[PDB]
Amino acid sequence: STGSATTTPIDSLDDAYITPVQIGTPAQTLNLDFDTGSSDLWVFSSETTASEVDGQTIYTPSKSTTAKLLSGATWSISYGDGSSSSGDVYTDTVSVGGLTVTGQAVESAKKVSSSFTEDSTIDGLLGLAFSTLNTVSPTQQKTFFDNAKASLDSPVFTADLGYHAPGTYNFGFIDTTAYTGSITYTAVSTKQGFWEWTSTGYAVGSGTFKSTSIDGIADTGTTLLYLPATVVSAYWAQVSGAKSSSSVGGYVFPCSATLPSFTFGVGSARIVIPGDYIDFGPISTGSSSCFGGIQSSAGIGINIFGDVALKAAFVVFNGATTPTLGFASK
Ligand code: NA
Numbered sequence: 001s002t003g004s005a006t007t008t009p010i011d012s013l014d015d016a017y018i019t020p021v022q023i024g025t026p027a028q029t030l031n032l033d034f035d036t037g038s039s040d041l042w043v044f045s046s047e048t049t050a051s052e053v054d055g056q057t058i059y060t061p062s063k064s065t066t067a068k069l070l071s072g073a074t075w076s077i078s079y080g081d082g083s084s085s086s087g088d089v090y091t092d093t094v095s096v097g098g099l100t101v102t103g104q105a106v107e108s109a110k111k112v113s114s115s116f117t118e119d120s121t122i123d124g125l126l127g128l129a130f131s132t133l134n135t136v137s138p139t140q141q142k143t144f145f146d147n148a149k150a151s152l153d154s155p156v157f158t159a160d161l162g163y164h165a166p167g168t169y170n171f172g173f174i175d176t177t178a179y180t181g182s183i184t185y186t187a188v189s190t191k192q193g194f195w196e197w198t199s200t201g202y203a204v205g206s207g208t209f210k211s212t213s214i215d216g217i218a219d220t221g222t223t224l225l226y227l228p229a230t231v232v233s234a235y236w237a238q239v240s241g242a243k244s245s246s247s248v249g250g251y252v253f254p255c256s257a258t259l260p261s262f263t264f265g266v267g268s269a270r271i272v273i274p275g276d277y278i279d280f281g282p283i284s285t286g287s288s289s290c291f292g293g294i295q296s297s298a299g300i301g302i303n304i305f306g307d308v309a310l311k312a313a314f315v316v317f318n319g320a321t322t323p324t325l326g327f328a329s330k
Contacts, residue, residue: 001151002172003099007034007161010121013280014307015223017161018121019169022095023106024064030057030123034169035221036159036195036317037304039133039143040077041094042085042107043124044116052112055120059108067092067106075107075135080222080300083115089136094144096126099171101148105134105141125221128157128317133193145171145319155319159220160330161311163277179314179328184269188323192302194219195317197325199305200267202227204235205260209270216303218315218325224280225262225273226297226304235262235294242292248283251292255282262294264309266327273312 007017018031023043030043044053046060061067067090076086087110094104109116109124116122127134131142149155152172160178161167168178189196194217203209214227232251236242238260242253253259259275278293293308316326 001099001148002153002170003095003097003148004168004170005097006166007169008166009162009164010119012164014161014164014311016119016122017167017220017307018123019096019126021126023059024061024092025066026064027095028057028059028064030059031121032124032126033122033221034126034128034159035219036128037217037219037221038077038079038125039127039129039131039193040075040107040135041105041124041126041144042075042077042087042109044112045087045108047087048109049111052117054117057123059106059124061090061092061106061108064092066102070105070136070139073105073136073139073141075137077135080304081115083113085109085112085116087111089141096144096171097169099148099152101144104144104147105136107136128220129195130190130193132190148172149319157317157319159310159315159317161220161307163274163311167311174316179330181329183314183316183326183328184266185316185318185324185326186266188325190323194302195323195325200265202231202265203263203270204238207238209263209265211265214264214303216297216305218310218317219304219306220310222304222306223308224304224306225294225308226300226306227294228303229296229298232294232296235260236292244296245289248289248291250295252283252289253292255288255290257290264305269327271309271313271327271329273309277308277312
């Protein structure tokens with residue numbers, strides 16, 4: 001089997017991407033944030049505290065003929081940005097892009113933090129990291145990908161995120177029309193439950209490539225590119241008037257600037273992030289200070305290749321017995 005779904009930016013900055021997901025029978029379609037940095041499929045629901053729901057579409061298990069309470073199971077998650085959610089668990093039929101899993105754990109939120117409530121466009125998350133990070137207790141649950149894997153034509157999914165445009169998540173196949181050149185594969189460590197890999201270096205603009213090992217994660221659920229402070233300082237030093245602002249919470253730059261590209265290495269291959277991808281616009285409405293898309297990972301404890309990096313590539317998440325990542329230009 002295979003599946004193919006379109007993923008759409010939630011706003012004009014590509015802050016996140018939503019993908020429609022069918023849950024239950026008859027289908028309830030919710031727009032979920034597919035997150036390769038977490039392992040819970042959780043949704044706004046008929047159980048969510050009413051004051052914490054503001055425009056999201058909710059899953060109502062009582063209206064699904066295939067929903068079953070997973071008795072005794074609870075979940076609670078905290079993300080890198082300080083947001084959180086928790087609740088109870090149902091099993092139900094879940095379909096993405098025509099690919100169906102029966103008996104998928106659907107984590108129903110009873111509580112969500114303010115950042116979720118305030119984002120009316122995101123109805124929940126679909127985690128695509130390794131199932132070792134799943135928060136369900138007392139019986140850990142599998143991801144949608146882990147449950148689908150054995151049925152797929154190939155044990156893979158791909159992320160093809162757009163810059164200010166829709167893109168695609170595919171399950172079970174490589175679309176050889178969706179990228180240019182060849183795919184360069186690189187080793188993955190699953191020790192922390194993430195798609196963790198080692199970049200071979202970077203370049204700033206037209207500058208020379210610096211060969212250096214940068215361990216980090218491929219995380220579709222993180223907006224920005226978080227890298228070591230040395231690399232980030234080298235990038236922003238090429239932008240006149242750029243500075244790190246403790247008041248704003250990272251590097252800002254004049255909105256009049258033209259940003260340089262950023263290149264990262266994947267083995268002997270190179271992925272180029274155009275300068276425009278690194279512009280996250282005014283820090284507040286009407287400001288002439290703009291927020292940078294490359295930020296320091298110091299204090300986060302891990303480097304994160306978030307959407308700013310991933311949307312410059314066609315990315316293969318290879319879930320074979322020995323997992324690997326692939327990157328191609330597009
Ligand atoms: Na922000």
